[PDB]
Amino acid sequence: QSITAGQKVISKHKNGRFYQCEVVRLTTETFYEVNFDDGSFSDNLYPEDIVSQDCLQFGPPAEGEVVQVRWTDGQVYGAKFVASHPIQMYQVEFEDGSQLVVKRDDVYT
Amino acid sequence: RHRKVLR
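Structure tokens for the assembled complex are given below, as produced in the milestone run.
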């Protein structure tokens, strides 16, 4: 059913193909969901991208909180705090020795 | 809402 470290699994390598992977490590890692004032959203945001208050030091904003967010072009947009998504991530390793931190079962089993 | 890839 569910995964632990040392386990063989199948997940995508950076070359774009699926390979055997051994999960070397498990980390919980949190993302932020926001409501951009342009009617779009994002839930794959790192806490550091909320520039209006320190969330990496004090925790998520209040829900519905007005917030400033550095988008992936490093430019700062107005949003509105939706939610904080605590996800279990999986660091795997391939035979060439590469390694990627990953989600689902984006590590199939 | 939409997913967001702009810029």
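Chain B has no helices and no strands. Chain B touches chain A through five residues (CB under 8 Å). Further analysis is deferred to the final report.
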